[PDB]
């Protein structure tokens, strides 16, 4: 399936029950057409090639647009072997580096 990342897990004790710490790099990759849409909506992007290269240059306006896109938009943290029903849970992601 498309739109899918993978990483090593770690422990966040500072979170709440509905939050997971997505990395910056994976989130910027996963939400790429959402970033294109917000860039064209905010008048900075006019064409798909300019949006592609503005993401692949990784500007501070792209980091702000990602921080606005992520806001209350859940992601499903699957783990395999997904034996029982609760092996897929959806969390509202918070941005971290790393």
């Amino acid at each position: 399936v498309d739109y899918s990342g993978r990483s090593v897990i770690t422990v966040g004790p500072y979170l709440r029950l509905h939050q997971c710490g997505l990395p910056k790099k994976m989130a910027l990759e996963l939400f790429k057409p959402f970033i294109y849409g917000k860039l064209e909506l905010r008048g900075l992007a006019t064409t798909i090639k300019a949006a592609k290269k503005m993401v692949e240059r990784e500007e501070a306006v792209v980091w702000d647009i990602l921080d606005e896109v992520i806001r209350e938009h859940p992601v499903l943290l699957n783990r395999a072997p997904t034996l029982h029903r609760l092996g897929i849970q959806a969390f509202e992601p918070v941005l971290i580096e790393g």
Binding site: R16, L17, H18, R71, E72, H73
Partner: protein
Amino acid sequence: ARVTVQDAVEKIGNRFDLVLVAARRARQMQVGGKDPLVPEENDKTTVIALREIEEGLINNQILDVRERQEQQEQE
């Protein structure tokens, strides 16, 4: 509903009808551009529609008679 939607569950009665009516309202806000009647506090359309249903300005038959009313005043 920004952490737990159980208040919207008690308002509707069922999770699947909650998802369906909130999807109807969020589609009306993203396509039709209708105004969210709760103050938005910089939120997305899905959580805005869940907060609408959670407050109680919209149910399934409320949205149905509202769309039928705008239909008959359009025609």
